[PDB]
Amino acid sequence: GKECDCSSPENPCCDAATCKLRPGAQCGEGLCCEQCKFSRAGKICRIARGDWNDDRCTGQSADCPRYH
């Protein structure tokens, strides 16, 4: 599988030995993740352009997906 919580091998929020959150933070990298923390759900992890469901950052998500 793949547990690379982050993509940077120098990030303090993740770990290179296991490519995953090293500290007790809540994320290694994303658009809705404070310095080692999960933003608050109901947040905007992106901005669609016409009609659909925005990428409301979840209370357990740090990056942002994409529907359109």
Residues 6+ apart with CB under 8 A from 19: 2, 3, 4, 5, 6
What does the chain come to in residues? Answer: 68
Q: How many domains does the chain have?
A: 1
Q: Whole domain around residue 19: which residue ranges?
A: 1-68
Q: Which residues contact 4 (CB under 8 A, 6 or more apart)?
A: 14, 19, 20
Rounded-to-integer distance, Cα 59 and Cα 9, Å: 25
- Taking alpha carbons only, the member of 1, 27, 2 closest to residue 14 is 27
CATH code of 4's domain:
4.10.70.10
Q: What are phi and psi of 58, to 5 degrees?
A: -85, 165
Experimental method: NMR
Q: How far apart are CA 23 and CA 42, in angstroms?
A: 25
Closest CA to 59 of 21, 22, 28, 33: 33
Helix-strand-coil percent breakdown of the chain, rounded to 5? Answer: 0, 10, 90
What is the maximum alpha-carbon separation in the chain?
A: 42
d(CA 16, CA 1): 16
